[PDB]
Write a structure and sequence with these properties.
Chain lengths: 428, 426, 20, 153
């Protein structure tokens, strides 16, 4: 009855979506050729008799990764024209992705979204995958979000952004692109989850003892997190939460809507046998500083709202005992105006492990989403970098020649200053 | 979808282009006959960037050849891999430049540009949409420099929104090759600084040293140096032909590297470079490549990076490797050598990864840097120009074709302004 | 020299068996 | 006599090399099929493929890949013949070898399964209507050969 539409933009979005869709197929038992040898209607449609097609859209200006997906194994699954490409990419240029190249393809993307929404009856909302530091993943994502907000508005919108790391960073104009896209999407987004690459590298190394991790492993972890998020809609449990109540429980202020995700427990087969994974133990482990997936130290901030999504063989009495112990713990401190800050959801479907992966099979899992004030330090560092580059007016001529004025840079700087001031005021 | 057209001019340009086409045709598994003899379907998925189909399974390179004498054209036509070039793409004159910039740029260029432009326009319109241009020439030549400058001006006048990549050689610091090297070098630089987008500088002393020491080849012939330059070219352009983990095309590199419109001179590098014998006693891994790229002896431009500060560094990796190792190596090299990087710009390193290693190896990388050490080259060129121009030596060969002292003064002023800019951005 | 090169995508997303 | 294993290994190596160029093989098949019309009946025999070869189809690479496929077929036939020379379950497995490698034999409905994913790389229409059997012929023969060797030893 309830349906969700996923949109993947850019290389990172396309690859993460590919991983999560193969995980979805494995969980639901649908063969890669589309033939299944009654609860999959949320993500999979029906084509006449015996064929199931996913409800997703893949968008990228460059045709390389989309062509690889079309040629790959999952070609008898995706609709032939649900995959949209172009000729030239944005190439780390927000102006190119926002003004010049995307305006001849946003119309087609919107037409396909409308056609997909026509099929559904109980549409819930959209999930958008992109990256802040990429030209297309910033500009085209902002354009698509503004067009969707204009067209529909009422339906909720959620994002899974890859937050650039403070130290391990790839491109050079990432602060410019991130500042511009944040200033554009602050007024249109509803709740944007945050993950990072260096944090996941550290988690993978320290826990699974893998010397040479890779993007495939990172995308598998992200797909596990997304599946844990959507399990409440996909299956039925003792206490399930939908996509509408997430924003209400996690967003206390109109512009403070930047939570972060956490997953536990993550271990390998060698440590799986010599360990007793209990509800209290995993709940305690989910709070340690060296387990979250955003590179920041939680003792520099205070928690505001925490969402717990237990998954598998879970007992409410020991869940409540673990929550009470965590509340009694003195090292973790909360904000004064939030007497109650816990949302608990339980599902009866144990996590599913992809064969040949680096994740051992378990019985319980905890996915945690936290809204905290520690993001102020990250925003401070990012705008300090922006100011340092913009003092000399470097790399500005590309944006100027593509159709942008320095007024946009000034306005974005002012908006980020205002947001940092809002965080500083709210923290006390 | 992304078509690249290649332009050649002069003796050095023609020879380097022949070697480059040989290497590229080897990469895609195309025999000198003209028929596909590959082994995987990945090789012909993107054969449209550099080749055109014709009749039954015959691929012809999309190249234009320009010269004033039929000598090197006949030599390359009678040599190996000479039966794949289109016979209609050989354009040549009859007189010759004779190491004169004025003759190439004012006298015979006028009668050659019409035909070469007609051919280039036909090749450009043959496709659906272009991506950019490439050019291999010599700054210090007589016909290559003038003809390439005139062509660059014409194309930039006609196609004003496409990238232009030039792979030009530069005068050697120790021993020159022509007496009038600084005049042509200065005029070519003055035109290139304004009519291009990114220029890669290559020397000959660096290639001589590399071929003498790394491969212990006691007979360094131009074939080997041209092969090295072609390998660098392929390493630069490989991302537009094969899938990878983190793609990065030419426009992406241009956006990420050049911060100011006039600071667009790069100097490349390559890795690994090991001998035939000592190859057995070395472990080929990512740390070895990271150690090898950041060295003065492994670069193809005769300059010392220790004398200047790096602005932006772009490294393109090929083969199967982990992103974590690359990230840790780049962070380590940026953190332990903070004295060699500018501070007002953070994250001086851009990384790209492909998945098809070069034939005969397992993993390789290409280094491209934009440093402040080009000021030494430009300062030496300007000093030589002033020293010769004070006595008006060899100048009567230029005024006899249409030149004037004003052009020389303006070119010297432009060099002084550019070197002052590089000095003051330090 | 034989060519034994294949992309990382094809060697990772192999058709896994369907569970019961 | 524990000596045909080398021939089997060479055959499977060449089959792997051909499986890499499967896509070009399908393109050549489609081009020659369009050139020779008869587009209402899918491929049913190897002799039909040989006739499509003999018909002017050109394009060089098409002839190369089709010649490679026919060479694999000929070597498989030779192996079916020689396994009896080197000497009930083995008998009818060899009978299946002979009857499948025989040129005049319907192969439109032939299919392969796990671990062979050759049919997953085809588009829906071609997989269910045109080229289901041709790409699924060699792996079945190789599996039969390995099973027969397993019974023999
Ligand atoms: N975790 C993860 N991050 C990825 C992956 N692929 C790309 N990224 C991130 O994405 C960033 C590049 O941004 P993108 O917008 O995706 O690059 P793009 O799609 O080519 O867009 P343009 O570069 O502007 O053309 C890199 O710095 C990576 O950190 C992936 O598979 N997994
Ligand atoms: N690396 C390399 N350099 C060359 C080659 N041929 C010529 N050169 C360089 O080109 C310079 C001579 O310029 P030249 O092309 O003869 O002038 P032009 O004929 O008027 O264009 C010399 O300094 C050489 O170093 C070659 O095959 N390889
Ligand atoms: Mg992109």
């Amino acid at each position: 009855m309830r349906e969700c539409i996923s949109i993947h933009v850019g290389q990172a979005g396309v690859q993460i979506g590919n991983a999560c869709w193969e995980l979805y197929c494995l969980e639901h038992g649908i063969q890669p050729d589309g033939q299944m040898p009654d609860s999959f209607n949320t993500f999979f449609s029906e084509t006449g008799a015996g064929k199931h097609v996913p409800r997703a859209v893949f968008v990228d200006l460059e045709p390389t990764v989309v062509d690889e997906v079309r040629t790959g194994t999952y070609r008898q699954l995706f609709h032939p024209e649900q995959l949209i490409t172009g000729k030239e990419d944005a190439a780390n240029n927000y102006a190119r992705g926002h003004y010049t190249i995307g305006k001849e393809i946003v119309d087609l993307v919107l037409d396909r979204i409308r056609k997909l929404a026509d099929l559904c009856t109980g549409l819930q909302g959209f999930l958008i995958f992109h990256s802040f530091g990429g030209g297309t993943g910033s500009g085209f994502a902002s354009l698509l979000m503004e067009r969707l907000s204009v067209d529909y508005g009422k339906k909720s919108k959620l994002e899974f952004a890859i937050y650039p790391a403070p130290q391990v960073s790839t491109a050079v104009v990432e602060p410019y692109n991130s500042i511009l896209t944040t200033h554009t999407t602050l007024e249109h987004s509803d709740c944007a989850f945050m993950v990072d690459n260096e944090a996941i590298y550290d988690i993978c190394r320290r826990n699974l003892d893998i010397e040479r991790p890779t993007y495939t492993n990172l995308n598998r972890l992200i797909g596990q997190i997304v599946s844990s998020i959507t399990a409440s809609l996909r299956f039925d449990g003792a206490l399930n939460v939908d996509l509408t109540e997430f924003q209400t429980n996690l967003v206390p202020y109109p512009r403070i809507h930047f939570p972060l995700a956490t997953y536990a427990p993550v271990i390998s087969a060698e440590k799986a046998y010599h360990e007793q994974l209990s509800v209290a133990e995993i709940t305690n482990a989910c709070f340690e500083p060296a387990n979250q997936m955003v590179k920041c130290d939680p003792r520099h901030g205070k928690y505001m709202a925490c969402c717990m999504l237990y998954r598998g063989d879970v007992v409410p009495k020991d869940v409540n005992a673990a929550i009470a112990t965590i509340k009694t713990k003195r090292t973790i401190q909360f904000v004064d105006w939030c007497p109650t800050g816990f949302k608990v959801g339980i599902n009866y479907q144990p996590p599913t492990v992809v064969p040949g992966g680096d994740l051992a099979k378990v019985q319980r899992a905890v996915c945690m989403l936290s809204n905290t004030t520690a993001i102020a330090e990250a925003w401070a560092r990012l705008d300090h970098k922006l100011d340092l580059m913009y003092a000399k007016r470097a790399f500005v001529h590309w944006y100027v020649g593509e159709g942008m004025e320095e007024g946009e840079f000034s306005e974005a700087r002012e908006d980020l200053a205002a947001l940092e001031k809002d965080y500083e005021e709210v923290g006390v | 979808m992304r078509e690249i057209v290649h332009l050649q001019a002069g003796q050095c340009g023609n020879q380097i282009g022949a070697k480059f086409w040989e290497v590229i045709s080897d990469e895609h598994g195309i025999d000198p006959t003209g028929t596909y003899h590959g082994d995987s379907d990945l090789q012909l998925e993107r054969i449209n960037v550099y080749y055109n189909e014709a009749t039954g399974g015959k691929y012809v390179p999309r190249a234009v050849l320009v010269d004033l004498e039929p000598g090197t054209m006949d030599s390359v036509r009678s040599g190996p891999f000479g039966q794949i070039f289109r016979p209609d793409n050989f354009v040549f004159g009859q007189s010759g430049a004779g190491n004169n910039w004025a003759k190439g740029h004012y006298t015979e260029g006028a009668e050659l540009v019409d035909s070469v432009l007609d051919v280039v326009r036909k090749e450009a319109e043959s496709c659906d949409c272009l991506q950019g241009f490439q050019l291999t020439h010599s700054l210090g030549g007589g016909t290559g420099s003038g003809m390439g400058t005139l062509l660059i001006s014409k194309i930039r006048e006609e196609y004003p929104d496409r990238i232009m990549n030039t792979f030009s050689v530069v005068p050697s610091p120790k021993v020159s090759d022509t007496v009038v090297e600084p005049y042509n070098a200065t005029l070519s630089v003055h035109q290139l600084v304004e009519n291009t987008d990114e220029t890669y500088c290559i020397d000959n002393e660096a290639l001589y040293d590399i071929c003498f020491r790394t491969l212990k080849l006691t007979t360094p012939t131009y074939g080997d140096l041209n092969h090295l330059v072609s390998a660098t070219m392929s390493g630069v352009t490989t991302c537009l032909r094969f899938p990878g983990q983190l793609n990065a095309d030419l426009r992406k590199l241009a956006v990420n590297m050049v911060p100011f419109p006039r600071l667009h001179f790069f100097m490349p590098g390559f890795a690994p470079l090991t001998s035939r014998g000592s190859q057995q006693y070395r472990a080929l891994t990512v740390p070895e490549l990271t150690q090898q790229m950041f060295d003065a002896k492994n670069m193809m431009a005769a300059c010392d990076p220790r004398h200047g500060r790096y602005l932006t560094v772009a490294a393109v990796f090929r083969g199967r490797m982990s992103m974590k190792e690359v990230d840790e190596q780049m962070l380590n090299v940026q953190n332990k050598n903070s004295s060699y990087f500018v501070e007002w710009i953070p994250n001086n390193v851009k990384t790209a990864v492909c998945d098809i290693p070069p034939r005969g190896l397992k993993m390789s990388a290409t280094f491209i840097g934009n440093s402040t050490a080009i000021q030494e080259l430009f300062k030496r060129i300007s000093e030589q120009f002033t020293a010769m121009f004070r006595r008006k030596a060899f100048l009567h060969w230029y005024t006899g074709e249409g030149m004037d002292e004003m052009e020389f003064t303006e070119a010297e002023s432009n060099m002084n302004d550019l070197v002052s800019e590089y000095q003051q951005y330090q | 020299v034989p060519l034994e090169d294949l992309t990382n995508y094809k060697m990772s997303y192999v058709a896994h068996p369907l569970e019961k | 006599m524990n000596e045909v294993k080398e021939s089997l290994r060479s055959v499977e190596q060449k089959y792997k090399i051909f499986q890499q160029q499967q896509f070009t093989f399908i393109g050549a098949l489609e081009h020659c099929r369009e050139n020779a019309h008869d587009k209402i009946r899918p491929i049913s025999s190897i002799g039909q493929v040989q006739s499509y070869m003999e018909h002017h189809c050109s394009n060089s690479t098409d002839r190369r890949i089709l010649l490679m496929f026919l060479d694999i077929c000929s070597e498989l036939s030779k192996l079916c013949q020689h396994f009896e020379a080197l000497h009930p379950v083995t008998n009818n497995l060899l009978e299946k070898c002979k009857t499948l490698v025989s040129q005049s034999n319907d192969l439109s409905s032939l299919r392969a399964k796990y671990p062979h994913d050759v049919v997953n790389h085809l588009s829906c229409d071609e997989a269910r209507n045109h080229y289901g059997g041709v790409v699924s012929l060699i792996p079945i023969i190789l599996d039969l050969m390995k099973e027969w060797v397993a019974h023999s030893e």
